[PDB]
């Protein structure tokens, strides 16, 4: 009746979650993985499978997800490693054994040990290499990270995105998030650049945004006085009220530029129609001539929890965070973390435009 959630002709949506597909990717009990750092073999992927980036390769989606083994209590005391799969139809997946991205004794172990390497953002250039955005963690400081490969499975760590901008200014500042600006060419998700430069959205607090020359070395827009440019921030009275999180990879599109996000919802100040202290997912637009022009975003949540796998008993309501999105057979695959402890998957269709998820 009045739950109807229309969404502007500009935004994706709605992505449809299909029948008996979800949970894609959920925890391994049996899965064991010998650890460099820890020198024993662990169960890398028993407790949470989730975070997850999506990318085009071989004919295939590829996906990377965050795991993490018991090796901790609760929040952030645990240690993650990216595990792999790929799939055929964007909904079943063929998963490795073994982690293909984690921490070793090279030259990150400072940055990331024992927190491990997570929630990974992955997008690829015209000529094939796949840039990482991904968090380091080692209990103290989370940096946004860059790794690089040309097969998803052998990456080259170059450590933190802000290590050499304006002579390490920025090296401890704590961050995560990275969403690159891409383009759909010739039926291909890629990386593009606007202004001569490569350009990303991150952050969690706020959305904030940062340029590059070669994808490795990232320097953050900052004011006149050198503090960090806010695009845009959490509000008052509605569900991005604590946080607005980046979420996959921004698309340049003939209405704009979109950068879909994840909105975290304040128990004092947000708004009580959702849960509070959870995710739910929205979008943002902005002016394709300029992308740190901010234009709108949606009011409502185009996607939030609404069947169990999505929740918990950790979270009874749920919570999902949108991170991987694939345009793969002429439909988009919209990949997420589902209460922290599964992926999930949704699929928008261009050609036959579903509802988004209803007003709660």
């Known amino acids: 009746n009045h739950k109807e959630n229309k969404l502007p002709d500009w935004a ?3 992505f449809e979650r299909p ?8 925890p391994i009990e049996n899965t064991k993985f010998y650890c460099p750092l820890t020198k024993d073999s662990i169960a890398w992927e028993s407790n949470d499978t989730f975070n997850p980036a999506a990318t085009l390769y071989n004919g295939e989606i590829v996906v990377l997800y965050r795991a993490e083994d018991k090796s901790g209590v609760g929040i952030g005391h645990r240690t993650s490693r990216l595990g792999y799969a790929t799939s055929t139809d964007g909904t079943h997946f063929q998963r490795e054994k073994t982690p293909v991205f984690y921490p070793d004794n090279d030259s990150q172990k400072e940055l990331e040990w024992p927190g491990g ?7 690829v250039t015209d000529d094939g290499l796949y840039v990482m955005m991904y968090t380091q963690w080692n209990r103290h400081v989370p940096r946004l990270a860059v790794a690089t490969s040309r097969n998803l499975k052998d990456w080259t760590k170059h450590g933190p995105a802000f290590a050499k901008a304006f002579d390490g200014k920025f090296f401890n500042l704590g961050c995560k998030s990275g969403s690159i600006l891409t383009e759909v060419v010739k039926g291909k998700q890629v990386i593009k650049k606007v ?5 990303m959205y991150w952050g969690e607090e706020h959305v904030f945004a940062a340029t590059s020359d070669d994808l490795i070395h990232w320097t953050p827009i900052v004011n006149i006085d050198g503090s960090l440019k806010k695009l845009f921030s959490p509000r008052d009275g509605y569900f991005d009220s604590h946080l607005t999180e980046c979420g996959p990879p921004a698309i340049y599109t003939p209405k704009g530029i979109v950068l879909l996000y994840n909105g975290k919802n304040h ?3 947000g708004d009580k129609r959702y849960t509070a ?16 022009r901010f234009i709108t975003r949606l009011d409502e949540p185009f996607f939030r929890p609404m069947d169990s796998f999505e929740k918990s008993g950790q979270y009874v309501d749920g919570t999902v965070f949108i991170e991987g999105m694939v345009y793969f057979k002429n439909k988009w695959y919209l990949y997420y973390g589902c209460a922290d402890s599964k992926v999930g998957v949704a699929v928008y269709d261009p050609k036959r435009p579903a509802k988004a998820d209803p007003l709660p």
């Open 19 to 26: 029948k008996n597909v979800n949970p894609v990717i959920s």
């Open 117 to 123: 390497c997570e929630d990974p953002r992955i997008a």
């Open 195 to 199: 202004n001569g430069k490569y350009f």
């Open 267 to 269: 128990s004092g100040r």
């Open 12 to 14: 994706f949506g709605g």
């Open 277 to 292: 202290n959870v995710y739910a997912a929205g979008q943002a637009l902005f002016d394709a001539n300029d992308p740190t």
